[PDB]
From a paper:
PqsBC, a key enzyme in the biosynthesis of the quorum-sensing signal molecules HHQ and PQS and a member of the β-ketoacyl-ACP-synthase III family of condensing enzymes, has unique features of a heterodimeric subunit composition and the lack of the canonical active-site asparagine. Alternatively, it can be channeled into HHQ biosynthesis by the activity of PqsBC, which catalyzes the condensation of 2-ABA and octanoyl-CoA to form HHQ. FabH-like enzymes are usually homodimers in solution; however, the PqsBC crystal structure we report here reveals that PqsB and PqsC form a novel heterodimer. PqsC lacks the conserved asparagine, and PqsB lacks all three conserved residues of the FabH catalytic triad, raising the question of how PqsBC mediates the condensation reaction.
PqsBCC129A crystallized in space group P212121 and the structure was determined to 2 Å resolution with the final model refined to crystallographic R-factors of Rwork = 0.190 and Rfree = 0.237. The crystallographic asymmetric unit contains four copies of PqsB and four copies of PqsC. An analysis of the interfaces reveals a large ∼2,238 Å2 surface area buried by interactions formed between the PqsB and PqsC subunits as shown in Fig. 2A. The structure is thus referred to as the PqsBCC129A heterodimer. This large interface between PqsB and PqsC is observed to be almost identical in the four copies observed in the asymmetric unit (values of buried surface area are 2,277, 2,240, 2,223, and 2,212 Å2 averaged to 2,238 Å2), and the heterodimers superimpose onto each other well with an average root mean square deviation of 0.243 Å (8,182 atoms). The fold of PqsC and PqsB is closely related to the FabH enzymes and PqsD with two subdomains each composed of a four-stranded β-sheet surrounded by α-helices. Substantial differences occur in the C-terminal subdomains with PqsB having a shorter sequence (124 amino acids) with only two α-helices and PqsC (160 amino acids) having four α-helices. The active-site residues His-269 and the mutated Ala-129 (replacing Cys-129) are clearly defined in the electron density. In a noticeable difference with other members of the FabH enzyme family, an asparagine amino acid does not form a catalytic triad with His-269 and Cys-129, and in its place a valine (Val-299) is present. Pro-242 breaks the helix α5 in PqsC and directs an alternate path for the polypeptide compared with FabH/PqsD forming an irregular loop structure, termed loop A, which effectively opens up the active site cleft. The shortened PqsC helix α5, a prominent difference to PqsD and FabH, widens the entry to the catalytic site and provides an extended cavity that could accommodate a bicyclic molecule such as the reaction product HHQ.
Numbering used by the authors:
A (entry chain B): 1 to 278
B (entry chain E): 1 to 279
C (entry chain F): 1 to 185, 187 to 214, 222 to 348
D (entry chain C): 1 to 214, 221 to 232, 235 to 348
The structure:
Amino acid sequence: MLIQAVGVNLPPSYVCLEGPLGGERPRAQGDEMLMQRLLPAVREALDEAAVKPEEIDLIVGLALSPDHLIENRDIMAPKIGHPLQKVLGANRAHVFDLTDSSLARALYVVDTLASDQGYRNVLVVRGESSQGLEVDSESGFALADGALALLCRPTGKAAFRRGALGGDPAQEWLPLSIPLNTDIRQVGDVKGHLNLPAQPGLPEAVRAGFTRLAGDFPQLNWVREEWFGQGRPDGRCLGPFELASQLRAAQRDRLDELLLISFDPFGMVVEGVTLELA
Amino acid sequence: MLIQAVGVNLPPSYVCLEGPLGGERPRAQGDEMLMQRLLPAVREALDEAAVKPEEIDLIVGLALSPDHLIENRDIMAPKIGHPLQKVLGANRAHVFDLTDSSLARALYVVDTLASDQGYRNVLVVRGESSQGLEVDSESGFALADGALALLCRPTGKAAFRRGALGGDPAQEWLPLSIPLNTDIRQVGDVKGHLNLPAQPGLPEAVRAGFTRLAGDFPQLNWVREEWFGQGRPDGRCLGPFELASQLRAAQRDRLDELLLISFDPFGMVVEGVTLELAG
Amino acid sequence: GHKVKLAAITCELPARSYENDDPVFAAVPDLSESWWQFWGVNRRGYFDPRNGENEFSLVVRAAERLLRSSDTAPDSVDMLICSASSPIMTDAGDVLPDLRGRLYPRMANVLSKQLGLSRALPLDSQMEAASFLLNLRLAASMIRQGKAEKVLVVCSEYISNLLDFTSRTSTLFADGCAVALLTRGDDSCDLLASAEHSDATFYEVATGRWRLPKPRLYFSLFSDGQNKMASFVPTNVPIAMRRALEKAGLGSDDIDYFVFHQPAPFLVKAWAEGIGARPEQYQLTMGDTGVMISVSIPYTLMTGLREGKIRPGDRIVMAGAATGWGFAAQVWQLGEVLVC
Amino acid sequence: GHKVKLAAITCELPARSYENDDPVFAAVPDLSESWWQFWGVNRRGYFDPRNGENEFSLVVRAAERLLRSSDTAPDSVDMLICSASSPIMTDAGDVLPDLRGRLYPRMANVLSKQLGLSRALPLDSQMEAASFLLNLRLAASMIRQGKAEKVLVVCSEYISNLLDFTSRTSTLFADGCAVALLTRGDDDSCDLLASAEHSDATFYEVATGRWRLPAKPRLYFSLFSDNKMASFVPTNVPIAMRRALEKAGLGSDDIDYFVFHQPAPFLVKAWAEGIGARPEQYQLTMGDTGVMISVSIPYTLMTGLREGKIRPGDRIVMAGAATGWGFAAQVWQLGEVLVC
Ligand SMILES: [Cl-]
Ligand code: NA
């Protein structure tokens, strides 16, 4: 998998949440919806790579947000890849969604499918506009809002690793879940609740997982997602969106290859994919 | 036909057009549409009579305006009676439209149909939001804009008369036509043109027609439409909407019966209908 | 009051017929045998104005033929009731000889003068596809109350000039005219009862809108499933029939034959089943005409008379739906009807 | 280029079957034989969560059966690919015993722990009704490129807990589950020869799920006249089939049998006729199951295998459409498939 370009568009408004899994993260406001940020991020990437919408072979979406996706804020399905195809004029694309996949896992799977199908231009998008989910007030866990666009050229050569978290190997980490709101009375009530129990050693265990996994490709520089504020400048973190500034640093540094490392709070694992750079 | 109640709502802007068929008439502005004006007129009448929307048996519309009827200003069909039924919740009603009919004629026909079907509450509505029609700049002829709601209780007893115009018997009167605009290029362009040839004796001929017709019911006070400004204070005229203040004067004066007279510019005739008033 | 007689009826269709495979449909998406069977359409006519056919000229022809054939003097017609669903009229004959494409006046004001109907009160009514029934109903009330003795009823549908021939919907609709004569009866024929109602829930589903390259059909359904009519489809037409039958003190078994509006075979069948009508008690006529808006009902009535399916002394129910939405039903006892 | 073997397949349907006249439909507007004929539905199942039946429990049952029957050690499974069209999941077994109604996680993470699939990469994908094809496609690319030797594929549709039994739409859809096993093939006897997938978002907004107050996701319809697809209905499925066939260097005539998504009989026929498939070369299965979203295809495949319509050594085309909209076709050379 070769990364041709990256686009990012994040809300300017940040919200801080206390707790061992807390931090200061971008947050979509009021009525704002994902497409408002996703479309410019995608355009940014298309413009950088000099690829037209009609040249896109595949669009693959990753978005947990259960509403606030498009102009009709109550739509949850079909998923955002479809209206994205429409507003782009991506008239040659196949569109599907990978749900709760990590980005690293999605890139690997997509590299594999897309190289096997002979595709040349593949769009992977990750986004959130999470007003429809209640934050975890006990742990401080929340999703970063915003949009990331990766315009890729498949090679079928991306290598992949799925690794355990570090720290105490007997510790049963409690995963993220998103229960449905069973008391939806009014318009604008949340549709679900973020539930990630307070586990103060978790950020460090994730970092230790990253460091172990990076050892499978010890000559590659690596980039990673930052889902927690602990230990970070300003306590600020961008979740998977943190990847953008790091990929851009890599392009600036003229790297040909790198390791991209995701954290999956559903599986409580870390996942890495090896990528080429334009 | 018994008139239970009347609602009227006219634009605040009166616009003067010069010409033998000119006058100063109410005019809808910008993107105003007929429903905005009609709905409150209708509600005034329903509130006065204490008649609920679900009690309405029949809704009959009269509106020439080829657009500016409802929220979507480009819709012309189906006609305004149908979205009216929707917004009111008039869920027991039958809805139809009588097109280019005069009001007197519509009231007669409706009295007849509705008494024969046993209806009790009938809503006859007349309105214009005529931005979609070009005024007749040569004659000065324009439609008055506004809304009139007549809540009726049919009796089947309404008498009707259709009469010729007055003035010179040898004079051939040239009717109103509304040709289609054959050069609709932009949005906001008119859909048709008001074409009523300049005929300076026409206002007086209509008025003499009114008087002749009224002579068939010498026992009745009468009310009439005024479509032309010639000879009227400040050239002000309200077209069919002139009827509202006259009907209210009639109730205040405790009239039980009256004659209502319309001018039909399409047929160039005058038409009268006899009505009872509530009280 | 007086008994109402359905005295005579005629129709005038376009001279030219267009098959399902006709090149007029070249820009329409390919349609299969499945579509044609489902809608029940095989061919249809469109007015050719270049050759003098239009909403007015054909009505003049049909009306002149009917008046001659029914031995009706023009001066004896007390009311003329016309309907035309298109907002655009195109011809005013000798009456307004220079006027071509127009919004107003409507037909009756002009047709009355063209035909020399010098005592006829002119009226132009609109209830879309149910307009023939509305007009029979208006006519019947006038006759019954003694306010008219002879009423001429017209429906004329020039819809082909508004159709979008890039669209599948353009394959369903077609042009045509109908004229009927109603008179004071005695006493072989009568309108026993009628019922009319309207429901505007789905008003916005089918509208005419001014569209730059003039009126065009627009569709607009936005629904949850939760906002239905008080009476669900397809029971509105049956409900109208029942209300009419009840007012007449009759049941379905008292009826010989049924005449329906003709939008699709499944819908007509649904209406028939809703009231107890057996398949052989009505005809499907959309096959060689297409859907002619207000003119489908009278054309179907006439067909049934002409083919011997409906005859003197028969009790019939006529019924249909219209955009808006509107519903109408009539119970007639028919005497002898002149088909001309 | 390793060969891809479709090794095994099974389904798990609800224990209870519901007829068209079943009282579960009492609040649905009355429907006729016209509705039932058109959609081709006679009966369908709904999961009963009170008797332990749901999207998760029935998959666990089916998957355990398939693994036991195909002699597949849980350790040997390299990847697990799940789909479920409903946004709501309801049960996480022994893994998350307290969690009930949920948006996330999806199935694969949880299922792989429940089944002991200790090496399986979990993936949850979404392409609505076409998800079984997507999943085979993903599985095949992984096998083909040497990245997996065994892949378990799951589609599970629990739609009945979302259906509005006051709506006609409730009569069309039903519940079910399917599980398949793909492996690296030894010999030439089984392979995925080619596939084609495409999407068209022109009519994206026509059928959407929305959060609606009475409060849960509901189907919402939106059609406005205020563009057509590049390829008109009903050609998108045939276009996908043609592309796949071209990529495999085959023609329609080289194909033994066809397996289609099952939304309605006229549509399936239209797809078949578009590619040149004869009526004896495919089955209609919606009659017994209802429309099971993603599960209709694998149920149909399984049916054809079980009944001897699809035999070892046959070349088949599998194809369908999905909301969004999406289109997928696959050309398989099949060997021996364990139906369990
Ligand atoms: Cl997992
Ligand atoms: Na005179």
